[PDB]
Design a protein around this ligand. Structure first.
Ligand SMILES: Nc1ncnc2c1ncn2[C@@H]1O[C@H](C[C@@H](N)CC[C@H](N)C(=O)O)[C@@H](O)[C@H]1O
Ligand SMILES: Nc1ncnc2c1ncn2[C@@H]1O[C@H](C[C@@H](N)CC[C@H](N)C(=O)O)[C@@H](O)[C@H]1O
Lengths: 499, 435
């Protein structure tokens, strides 16, 4: 209710955007940055442990908003992730994007400034607009950066609708100097929307380094750091590769052929490697068709595509962790497990997928109900199932039992429906221990032990105190549980911590 | 410092209502320079014709000077008239870093209407020095706005660019042409194996952005407007940098321009964005080595089309350590070696070789060189009249009483006295007069 010569205000604002400098602004950016600093409200709850009957699994799938997962993982994975890959929602005309964080309680708590005029900003931010999509991506990218090791990188798939906004957002978050580069993937051969004579047939894969100084994307008689690698690769040397090597006849693993026959070794990541017909959308569709989940996931990425990203951004034999927090059909872990089996590596993975209702009219709905024992069909149901089937089919073909296709499923509960185990695993997470660090040994529904530290939940001076007559190891108590005085004090000295 | 707390806060609150926008230092002055009246006029410098076709007036033009002043000056006659623009502006890379030039102009008069040097001005030019985005965007804005004015309803603009400024460019064109009028982007493979792979990356491509004046009226098929324009067509080895440098070598100009585009690349662009027989005009106001018009000539000569071009090229002084210096000052006998010299010699050599291969009397390979003088005194009467005709809607393609009166189509005179007074026979001509 004021005077339309507010050009005063609009002038002062614009001149201040000049003084403030180069920056991509948009409606709601201020709150998106505040959501990033809010405490974490969630806790992990164990749900399932899948093995494929071989063996505690080094891999993990978390169900929930990736905003909550990442906040939760920060307590133990700050500067621990080797690579992040995310295929987020493009903000196309077709599947157009609604800003979800409107609804979060901590966002409405963040909106304590004024719960009236808010109607105008809702329309301005809106649906299919850039403001909503960018607000959504900001806090999650910031957290993703927090989880990267210094030699870590993040890849993000994107199309024309938000490529440029994305690149500029990542510049602001990761530092423009840490832009590694962009990869082009060919998506199709012929277009069907050739309305103006253009056959638009590609998308983008942006790569940012946490610290580009440490980035590397390459692919005598005494023992040394050579440790000769696999003599077989997934190649095309059918006849000139399937043959025979104390007597024992060695033949190459099936689906793979010998690298021999009856500086010039490193490979660079080429910015156009994915412009080849191999990485088109057709390839992914046939992959999920063949897992029987083709009715249920409409736009997966492709395995050989993901396999190459992983191969260039990770090492085979150092427990590199791969995080994908926009999982979808789980193509990333299908790639990880499949590459790990090929070079006999130990890559670990963390997957995140929100649990959004599948609508009744979708084919996956009945599949979830009937085939997947599910009360309310969620997208994570078929995420998990695709991973199961891939792990199961890799397991059948691969023989190495020192090869880990299992994972554990976790959900996110708002911070008494927690097991003692959930309570203890949450305390160990809050204490630096990670999801792969051996599912802490059980000791009597009250005390648990991870790596070489114990985690105490029902500090009733049972053998709890008598076992804790073992010195030289850190003891953590859950300070939000109930706790007996005499036991606390008798546990006298100083390598103890209540949290 | 406590007062700043709401200043930066009122700003955030104002940006929320302002909405989505790419901002940078000096965008406001960049938009004001667009609106400043044109300060220059044209002076004929040369007329070239390859073979004895003797087509006294070529329909093709080359303008030496600042594309900013050029487009402002073409805006009268050539508004909504250009069919396809192509520009390969400076990329603002790390080595060939880009300095903002426009703050040596009537940007001074604009800053005089503001506060003038004065302590505040030393703040804006410091935050906008050397290879910043802000200087490059401020530079690109007014010229891109003018480029839009000249495109016709069915016009498109193509802009080459690399990773340094792609995203900034895409967002700047969205604001100028409308996001809906974004056509698509094309990918050109640049090389096979890169200079140095410091981090194991082999970065081998660049971008070609396409915007339409009005995406409703655009057609990028090949014929008379069927074969589509594939967004990955230039990812083939055929369009790498080595092709282009191979062509300058073949014209004897290998040592004289550094990173030229390639003829086969520009040809396919012209083929998809223009009809062969309709007088479509191609405008390229970052001429460089003039690959663009080499391509439209070579293309007109195969399907016998009538496309016309307009080149603009700044007359930047070449320095004595660059080999083209000795070349311009002797071979081209230029008093001052400027990049436009080698622009025009490449166009000439290509017109020659194409002429010597053609058997077509009526294929137009010549052009006129115009220069841009501030005077607004060193203008011959025909130049005085050329500007007169130019501002009344007559195109440079159109040809204009012995130093007294001129007739471009059914119309102009500089000295309006006796001889012309009786010359009023051709009643109903609506002839124009100067001031
Ligand atoms: N807040 C969120 N947290 C976690 N996942 C989300 C969230 N929002 C959307 N997603 C999911 O991220 C996925 C986006 C997909 N494009 C991912 C594709 C996946 N790479 C594939 O190959 O199928 C969808 O499954 C989304 O439901
Ligand atoms: N204000 C300006 N007005 C006209 N030309 C300019 C201006 N600034 C830079 N240029 C020139 O535009 C050209 C940019 C080049 N990259 C174009 C190369 C050209 N497409 C080729 O194939 O060789 C350079 O020759 C610049 O000197």
């Amino acid at each position: 209710v004021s005077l339309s010569a507010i050009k005063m205000l609009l002038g002062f604002n614009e001149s201040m955007n000049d003084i403030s400098g180069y920056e991509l602004t948009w409606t709601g950016k201020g709150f998106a940055n505040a959501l990033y600093s809010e405490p974490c409200q969630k806790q992990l709850k164990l749900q399932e442990s899948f093995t494929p009957q071989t063996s505690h699994p080094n891999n993990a799938i978390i169900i929930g908003d990736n905003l909550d997962a990442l906040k939760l993982l920060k307590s133990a994975y700050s500067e621990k992730i080797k690579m992040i890959y995310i295929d987020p929602p493009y903000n196309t005309g077709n599947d157009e994007f609604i800003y979800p964080d409107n609804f979060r309680q901590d966002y409405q708590k963040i909106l304590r400034e004024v719960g009236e005029s808010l109607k105008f900003f809702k329309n301005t931010q809106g649906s299919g607009t850039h403001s909503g999509w960018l607000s959504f991506m900001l806090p999650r990218l910031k957290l993703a950066r927090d989880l990267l090791k210094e030699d870590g990188v993040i890849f993000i798939s994107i199309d024309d609708n938000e490529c440029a906004n994305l690149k500029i957002l990542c510049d602001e978050i990761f530092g423009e100097d840490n832009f590694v580069g962009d990869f082009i993937r060919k998506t199709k051969s012929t277009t069907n929307d050739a309305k103006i004579g253009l056959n638009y047939q590609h998308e983008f894969l942006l790569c940012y380094a946490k610290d580009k100084n440490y980035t590397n994307l390459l692919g005598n008689d005494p023992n040394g750091a050579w440790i000769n690698d696999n003599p077989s690769a997934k190649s095309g040397n059918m006849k000139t590769g399937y043959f025979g090597v104390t007597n024992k006849v060695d033949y190459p693993p099936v689906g793979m052929f010998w690298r021999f026959s009856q500086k010039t070794t490193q490979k660079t990541f080429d910015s156009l490697i994915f412009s080849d017909n191999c990485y088109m959308n057709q390839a992914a569709t046939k992959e999920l068709l063949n897992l029987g989940m083709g009715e249920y996931f409409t736009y997966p990425k492709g395995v050989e595509f993901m396999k190459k990203i992983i191969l260039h951004s990770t090492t085979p034999n150092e427990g590199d962790i791969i995080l994908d927090f926009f999982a979808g059909s789980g193509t990333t872990v299908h790639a990880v497990m499949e590459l790990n089996a090929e070079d006999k590596g130990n890559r670990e993975f963390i997957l995140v997928q929100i649990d959004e209702e599948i609508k009744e009219d979708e084919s996956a709905y009945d599949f979830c109900k009937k085939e997947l024992k599910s009360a309310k069909p969620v997208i994570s149901d078929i995420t998990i199932e695709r991973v199961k089937r891939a792990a199961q089919k890799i397991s059948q073909l691969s023989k190495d039992s020192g090869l880990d296709l299992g994972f554990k499923v976790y959900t996110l509960q708002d911070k008494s429906d927690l097991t003692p185990f959930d309570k203890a695993l949450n305390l160990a997470l809050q204490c630096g221990k990670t999801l792969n660090q051996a599912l802490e040994i059980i000791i009597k529904d009250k005390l648990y032990k991870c790596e070489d530290a114990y985690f105490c939940i029902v500090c009733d001076e049972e053998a709890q105190e008598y076992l804790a007559k073992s010195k030289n190891e850190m003891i953590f108590l859950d300070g939000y549980e109930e706790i007996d005085l005499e036991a606390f004090l008798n546990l006298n000295a100083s390598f103890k911590e209540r949290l």
